[PDB]
Structure formats: C-alpha cells, structure tokens
Coordinates of C-alpha atoms and ligand atoms in Angstrom, one line a residue:
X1 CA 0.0 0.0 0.0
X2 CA 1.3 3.2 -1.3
X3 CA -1.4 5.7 -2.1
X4 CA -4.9 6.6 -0.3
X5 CA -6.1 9.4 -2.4
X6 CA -9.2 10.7 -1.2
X7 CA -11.6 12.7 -3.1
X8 CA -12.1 16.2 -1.7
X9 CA -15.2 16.3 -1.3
X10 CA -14.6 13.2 0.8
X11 CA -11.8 14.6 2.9
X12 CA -13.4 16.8 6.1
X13 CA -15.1 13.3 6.6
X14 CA -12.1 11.3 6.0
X15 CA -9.8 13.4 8.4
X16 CA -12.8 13.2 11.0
X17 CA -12.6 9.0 10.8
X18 CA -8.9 8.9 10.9
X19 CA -9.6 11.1 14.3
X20 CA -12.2 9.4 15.9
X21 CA -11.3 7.7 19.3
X22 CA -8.1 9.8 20.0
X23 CA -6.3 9.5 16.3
X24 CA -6.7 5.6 16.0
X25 CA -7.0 5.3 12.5
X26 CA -4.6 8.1 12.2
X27 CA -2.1 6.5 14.2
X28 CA -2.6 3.2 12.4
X29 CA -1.6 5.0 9.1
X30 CA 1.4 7.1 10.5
X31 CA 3.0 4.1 12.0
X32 CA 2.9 2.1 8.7
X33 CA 5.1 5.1 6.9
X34 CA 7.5 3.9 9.4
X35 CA 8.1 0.9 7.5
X36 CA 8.7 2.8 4.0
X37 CA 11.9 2.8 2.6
X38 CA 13.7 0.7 5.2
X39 CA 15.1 -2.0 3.4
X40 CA 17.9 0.5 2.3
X41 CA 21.3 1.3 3.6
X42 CA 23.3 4.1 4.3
X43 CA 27.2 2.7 4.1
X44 CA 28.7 5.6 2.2
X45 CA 27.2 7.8 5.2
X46 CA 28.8 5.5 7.8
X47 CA 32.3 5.7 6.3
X48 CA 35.3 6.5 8.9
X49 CA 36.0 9.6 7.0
X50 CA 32.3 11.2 6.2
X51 CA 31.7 10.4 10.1
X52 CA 32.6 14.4 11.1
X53 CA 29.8 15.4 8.2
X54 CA 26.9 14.4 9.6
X55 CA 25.4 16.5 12.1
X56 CA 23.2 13.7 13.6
X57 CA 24.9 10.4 13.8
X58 CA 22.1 8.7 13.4
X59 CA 20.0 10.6 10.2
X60 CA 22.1 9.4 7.2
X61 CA 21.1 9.6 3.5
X62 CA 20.6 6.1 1.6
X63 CA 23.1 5.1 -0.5
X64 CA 20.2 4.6 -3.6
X65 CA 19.1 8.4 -3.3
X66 CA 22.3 10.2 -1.8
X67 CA 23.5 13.5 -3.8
X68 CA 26.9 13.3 -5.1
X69 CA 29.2 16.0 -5.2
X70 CA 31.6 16.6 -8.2
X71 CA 35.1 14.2 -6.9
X72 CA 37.7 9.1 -2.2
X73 CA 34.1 10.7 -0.4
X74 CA 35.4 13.8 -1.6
X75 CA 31.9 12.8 -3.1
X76 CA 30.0 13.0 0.5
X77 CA 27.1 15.2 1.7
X78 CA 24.5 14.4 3.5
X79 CA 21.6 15.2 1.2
X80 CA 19.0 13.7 -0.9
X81 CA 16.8 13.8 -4.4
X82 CA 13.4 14.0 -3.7
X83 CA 10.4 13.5 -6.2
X84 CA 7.3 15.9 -6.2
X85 CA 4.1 16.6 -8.2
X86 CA 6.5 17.3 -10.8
X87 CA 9.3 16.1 -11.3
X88 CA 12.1 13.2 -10.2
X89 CA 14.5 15.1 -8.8
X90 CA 12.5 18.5 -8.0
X91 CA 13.7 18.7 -3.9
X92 CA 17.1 18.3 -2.5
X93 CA 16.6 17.4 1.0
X94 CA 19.6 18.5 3.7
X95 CA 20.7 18.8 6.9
X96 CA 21.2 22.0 8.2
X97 CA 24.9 22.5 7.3
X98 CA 28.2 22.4 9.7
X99 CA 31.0 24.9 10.0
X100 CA 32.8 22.1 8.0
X101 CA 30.1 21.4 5.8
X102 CA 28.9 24.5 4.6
X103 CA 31.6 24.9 1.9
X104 CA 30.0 21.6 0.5
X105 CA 26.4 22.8 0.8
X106 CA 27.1 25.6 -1.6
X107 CA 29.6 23.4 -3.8
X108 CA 26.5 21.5 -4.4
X109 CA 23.8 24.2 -4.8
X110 CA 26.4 25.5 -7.5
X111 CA 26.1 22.2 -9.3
X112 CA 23.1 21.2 -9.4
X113 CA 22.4 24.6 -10.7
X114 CA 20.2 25.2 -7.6
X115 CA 18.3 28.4 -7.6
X116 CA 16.0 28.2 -4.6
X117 CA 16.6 27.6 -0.5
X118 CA 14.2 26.9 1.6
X119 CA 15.2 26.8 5.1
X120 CA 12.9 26.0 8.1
X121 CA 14.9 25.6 11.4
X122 CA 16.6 28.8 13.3
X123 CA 20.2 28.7 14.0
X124 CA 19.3 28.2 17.7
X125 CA 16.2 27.0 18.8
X126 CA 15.9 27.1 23.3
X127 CA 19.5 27.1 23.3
X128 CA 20.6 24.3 21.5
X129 CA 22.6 24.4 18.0
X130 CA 20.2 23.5 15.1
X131 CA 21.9 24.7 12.1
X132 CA 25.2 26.6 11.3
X133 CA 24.9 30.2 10.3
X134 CA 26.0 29.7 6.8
X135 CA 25.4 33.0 4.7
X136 CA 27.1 35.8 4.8
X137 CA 24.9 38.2 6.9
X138 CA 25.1 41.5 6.1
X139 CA 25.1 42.6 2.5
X140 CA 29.0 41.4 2.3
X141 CA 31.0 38.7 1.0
X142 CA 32.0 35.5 2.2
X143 CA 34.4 32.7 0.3
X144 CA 32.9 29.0 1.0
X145 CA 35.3 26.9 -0.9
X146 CA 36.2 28.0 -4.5
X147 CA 33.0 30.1 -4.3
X148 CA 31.9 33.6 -3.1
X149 CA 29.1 34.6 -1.9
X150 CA 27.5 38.2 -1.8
X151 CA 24.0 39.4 -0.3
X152 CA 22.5 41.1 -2.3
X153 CA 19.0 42.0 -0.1
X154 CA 17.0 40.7 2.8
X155 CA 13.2 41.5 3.7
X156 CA 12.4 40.8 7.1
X157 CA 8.9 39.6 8.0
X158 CA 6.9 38.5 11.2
X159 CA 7.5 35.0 10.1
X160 CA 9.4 34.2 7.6
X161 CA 12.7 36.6 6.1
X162 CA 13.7 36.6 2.1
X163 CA 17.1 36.8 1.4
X164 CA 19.2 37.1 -2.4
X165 CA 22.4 36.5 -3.1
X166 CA 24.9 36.7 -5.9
X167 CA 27.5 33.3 -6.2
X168 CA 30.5 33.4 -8.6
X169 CA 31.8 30.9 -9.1
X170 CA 27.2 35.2 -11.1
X171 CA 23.6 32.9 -10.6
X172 CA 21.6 34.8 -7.9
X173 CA 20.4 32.4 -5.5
X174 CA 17.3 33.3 -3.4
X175 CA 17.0 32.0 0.6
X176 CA 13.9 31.6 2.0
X177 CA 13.5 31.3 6.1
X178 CA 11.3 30.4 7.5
X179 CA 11.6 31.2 11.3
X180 CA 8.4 30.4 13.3
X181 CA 8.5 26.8 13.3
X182 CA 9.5 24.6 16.1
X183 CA 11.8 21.5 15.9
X184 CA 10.1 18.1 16.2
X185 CA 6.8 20.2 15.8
X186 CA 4.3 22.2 13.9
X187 CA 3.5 25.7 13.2
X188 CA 0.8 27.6 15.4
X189 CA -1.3 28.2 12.5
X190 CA -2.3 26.7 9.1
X191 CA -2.8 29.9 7.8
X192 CA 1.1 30.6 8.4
X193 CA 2.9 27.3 6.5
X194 CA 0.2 27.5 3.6
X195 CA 1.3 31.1 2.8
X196 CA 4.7 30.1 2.7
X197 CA 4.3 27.1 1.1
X198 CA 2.8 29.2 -1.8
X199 CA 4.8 31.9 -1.8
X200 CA 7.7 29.9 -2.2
X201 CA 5.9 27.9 -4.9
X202 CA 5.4 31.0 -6.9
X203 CA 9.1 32.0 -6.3
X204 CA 10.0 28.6 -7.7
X205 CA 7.7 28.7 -10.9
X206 CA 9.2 32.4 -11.9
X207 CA 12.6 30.3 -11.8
X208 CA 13.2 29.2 -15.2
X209 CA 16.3 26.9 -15.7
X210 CA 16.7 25.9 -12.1
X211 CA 17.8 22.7 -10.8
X212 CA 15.8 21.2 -7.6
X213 CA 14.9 23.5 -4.7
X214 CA 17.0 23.1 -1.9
X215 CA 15.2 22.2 1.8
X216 CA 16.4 21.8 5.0
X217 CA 15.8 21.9 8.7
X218 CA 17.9 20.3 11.1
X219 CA 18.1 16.9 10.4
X220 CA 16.3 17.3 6.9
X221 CA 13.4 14.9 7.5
X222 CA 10.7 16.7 10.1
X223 CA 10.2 20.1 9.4
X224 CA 11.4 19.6 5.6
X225 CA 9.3 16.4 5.2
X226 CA 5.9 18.5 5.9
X227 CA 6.9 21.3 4.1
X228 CA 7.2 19.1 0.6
X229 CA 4.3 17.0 1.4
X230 CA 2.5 20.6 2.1
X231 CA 4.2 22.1 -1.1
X232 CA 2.8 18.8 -2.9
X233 CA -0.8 18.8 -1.9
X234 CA -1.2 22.1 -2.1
X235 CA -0.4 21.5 -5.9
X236 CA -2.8 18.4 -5.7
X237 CA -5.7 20.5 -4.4
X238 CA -5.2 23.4 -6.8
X239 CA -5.2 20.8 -10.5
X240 CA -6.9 17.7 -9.4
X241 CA -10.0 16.3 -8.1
X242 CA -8.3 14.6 -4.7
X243 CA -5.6 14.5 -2.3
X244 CA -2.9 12.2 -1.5
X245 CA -1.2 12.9 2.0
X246 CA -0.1 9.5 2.7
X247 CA 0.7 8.7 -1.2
X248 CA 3.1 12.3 -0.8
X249 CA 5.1 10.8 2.7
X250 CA 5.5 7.2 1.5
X251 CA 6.8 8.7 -1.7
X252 CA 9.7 11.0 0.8
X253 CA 10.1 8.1 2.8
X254 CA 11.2 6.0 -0.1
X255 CA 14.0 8.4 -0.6
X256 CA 15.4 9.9 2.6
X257 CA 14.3 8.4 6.6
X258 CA 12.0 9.7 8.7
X259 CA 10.7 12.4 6.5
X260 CA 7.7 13.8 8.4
X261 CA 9.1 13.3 11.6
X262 CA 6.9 12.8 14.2
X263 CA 2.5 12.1 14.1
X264 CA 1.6 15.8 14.6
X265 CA 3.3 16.8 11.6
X266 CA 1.0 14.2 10.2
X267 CA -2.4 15.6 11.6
X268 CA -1.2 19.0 10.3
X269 CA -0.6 18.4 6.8
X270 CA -4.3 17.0 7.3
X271 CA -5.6 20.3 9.0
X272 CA -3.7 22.5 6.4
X273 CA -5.8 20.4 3.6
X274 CA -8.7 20.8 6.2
X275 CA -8.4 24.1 6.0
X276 CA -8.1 25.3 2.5
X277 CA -11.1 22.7 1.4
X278 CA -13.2 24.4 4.1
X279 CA -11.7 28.2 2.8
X280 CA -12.7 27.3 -0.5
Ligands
UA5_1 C1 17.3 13.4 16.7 C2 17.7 13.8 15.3 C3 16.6 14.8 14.8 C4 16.8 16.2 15.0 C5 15.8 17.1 14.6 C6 14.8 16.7 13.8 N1 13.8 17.6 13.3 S1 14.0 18.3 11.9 O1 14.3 17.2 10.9 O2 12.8 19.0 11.7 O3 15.2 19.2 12.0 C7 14.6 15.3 13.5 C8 15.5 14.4 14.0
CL2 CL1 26.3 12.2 -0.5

C-alpha cells in the first residue's frame, strides 16, 4: 500500500474517521510510513572519514538516493533527491549544514544549478545548536570553498525573512526562512505554512532553468518532510480532483528516513488540507 487518495469532497469526513477515538485510525496509518523505505542502507554515510559530516549520527542519507558531489568521499554530503508533483529530482533534502560542511552545501547548490533555498529551522532553537549560520549576513562577502558569496538583499517579516544572493563561481540564489517553526513540531497556524508554502511555490515557478529546490531543517526529515508533502498537496488541491497525504510521505520516505518526523506533523498536513477545502 502506497497511495490513499481521497476525493475532496470526501476529505473533512475522512480526516474526521482517521480522528475518531483519540487519532486511532490516524495512528494506524502514521505508523505504517515507518516501515517505508527501510530496506535501504546508508554505508557511504557511515564511512570513517564522512563520520565528522553528519550532524546527527544517526540521520544518514541512503546510499540509492544520496546527492553526489563533483570528486575518495570527496563525493559526501549528507543530502538527498526528492520527487514531487512534478518532477524526479525536483527537492534536495539537507541537513542544516556544519561549519565544515557548509563549503559543500554551496559546492553543491552550484552544481546542481540550484536556484531556490528553503530553510525552516533557526540557528538556535531554546538554546541548542540547530543549524550553522552559513550566509554571509550583512550585505557582504563571504568565500565557502572556490565560491563567493555576496548578499544582495534581505526583507524581514513576522515569520518568515527573504534573502538574495549573488554566487560566482554570477547565478543569484534566493533564501527563503522560515523562522516560526519549532523542531520536532508544527507551526501555530495553518494559515502561516500554507502562505509560505505558496509563496515559495510562486518563487520557484518564476525560476526558469533551475535545478531542484533546496530544503532543510535540522536533520532534513521533520520540518522539511511536511513542508514538501504541504508544497505537494497544495499542488494536488489546486489541479486535481483529490488529495494524496499518505501517497506524498510514502513517496519522501522512499528516498530519505523519517521524512515527516513525528504524528503531529502528520495531523497537520491534514488540518492545512482541512483548512483550504473548508476556505474554498
Ligand atoms: C534526533 C535527530 C533529529 C533532530 C531534529 C529533527 N527535526 S528536523 O528534521 O525538523 O530538524 C529530527 C531528528
Ligand atoms: Cl552524498
């Protein structure tokens, strides 16, 4: 089992059944995503000398959907292609980058001809280290590797801030953060992601040529899982005649573990769906 679409005008009722007796059904389909993908391994990861480039030692790409960089594992970061509504390789997934990383993390947004960030963690989230600071941060210039990097602009808003930046390597390269959104958690509206989620959609459609839109978080699989399921079904809901939520996160789990990390990321993607349907 791989899909459930449901047909929207079946999906208030559908999202009330999976609810029913505290989330039982809901559970019962959450837990079988667990299974999804797990036959796969992750040796290149787990490789003496890629062991200081993963920033969780225990959330490693697999070896069948790993992105290469250009070049022993010279070759290494911890990233991944993920499918969408649209494409095969339309998301790379990431881990928030390291101080030793991040030289890697724009080698391969240069390569892959990347022309879009999305980025959903803060640096520090209640005092503990989430993500590198890897940009530089006030219209300046940074090197990171054979690479520089410029800023160009930055619009702060109440939740999310919109940042371009010229790379030479002169692509500009626009950084979208998202700052509202708790780790292992969800955001404390619908309202809030879905704008985002479409704004960076429309971003991403005025992007001709680029390769896949980068995403991280973290550990690349919570917060970045729900935003491409969100950025998926959205999509759905807009061209088609129903929805598939758990056909969207067994598709991410195929490629990359864990990807929509934890059940109430699950219900949300549900209530965001919910909640356009009802809008509408
Ligand atoms: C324990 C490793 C881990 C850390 C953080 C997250 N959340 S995140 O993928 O949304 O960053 C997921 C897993
Ligand atoms: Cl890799």
């Amino acid at each position: 089992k791989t899909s459930c679409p449901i047909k929207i005008n079946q999906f208030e009722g559908h999202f009330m059944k999976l609810q029913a007796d505290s989330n039982y059904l809901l559970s019962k389909e959450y837990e079988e995503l667990k299974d999804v993908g797990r036959n796969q391994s992750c040796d290149i990861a787990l490789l003496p000398e890629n062991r200081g480039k993963n920033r969780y030692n225990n959330i490693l790409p697999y070896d069948a959907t790993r992105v290469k960089l250009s070049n022993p594992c010279s070759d290494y970061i911890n990233a991944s292609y993920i499918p969408g509504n649209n494409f095969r390789r339309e998301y790379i997934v990431t881990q928030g980058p390291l101080p030793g990383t991040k030289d890697d993390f724009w080698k391969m947004v240069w390569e892959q001809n990347v022309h879009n960030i999305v980025m959903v963690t803060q640096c520090v989230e209640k005092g503990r280290v989430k993500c590198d600071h890897y940009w530089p941060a006030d219209q300046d210039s940074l090197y990171y590797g054979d690479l520089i990097l410029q800023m160009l602009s930055e619009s702060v808003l109440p939740e999310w801030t919109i940042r371009e930046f010229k790379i030479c390597g002169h692509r500009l390269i626009r950084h979208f953060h998202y700052t509202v959104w708790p780790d292992h958690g969800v955001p404390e509206t619908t309202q809030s992601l879905i704008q985002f989620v479409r704004t960076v959609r429309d971003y991403i459609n005025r992007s001709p040529g680029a390769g896949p839109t980068v995403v991280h978080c973290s550990a690349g699989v919570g917060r970045t899982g729900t935003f491409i399921a969100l950025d998926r079904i959205l999509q759905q809901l807009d061209s088609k005649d129903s929805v598939d939520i758990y056909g969207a996160v067994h598709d991410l789990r195929l490629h990359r573990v864990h990807m929509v990390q934890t059940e109430c990321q699950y219900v949300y993607l549900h209530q965001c769906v919910r909640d356009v349907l009802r809008a509408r």
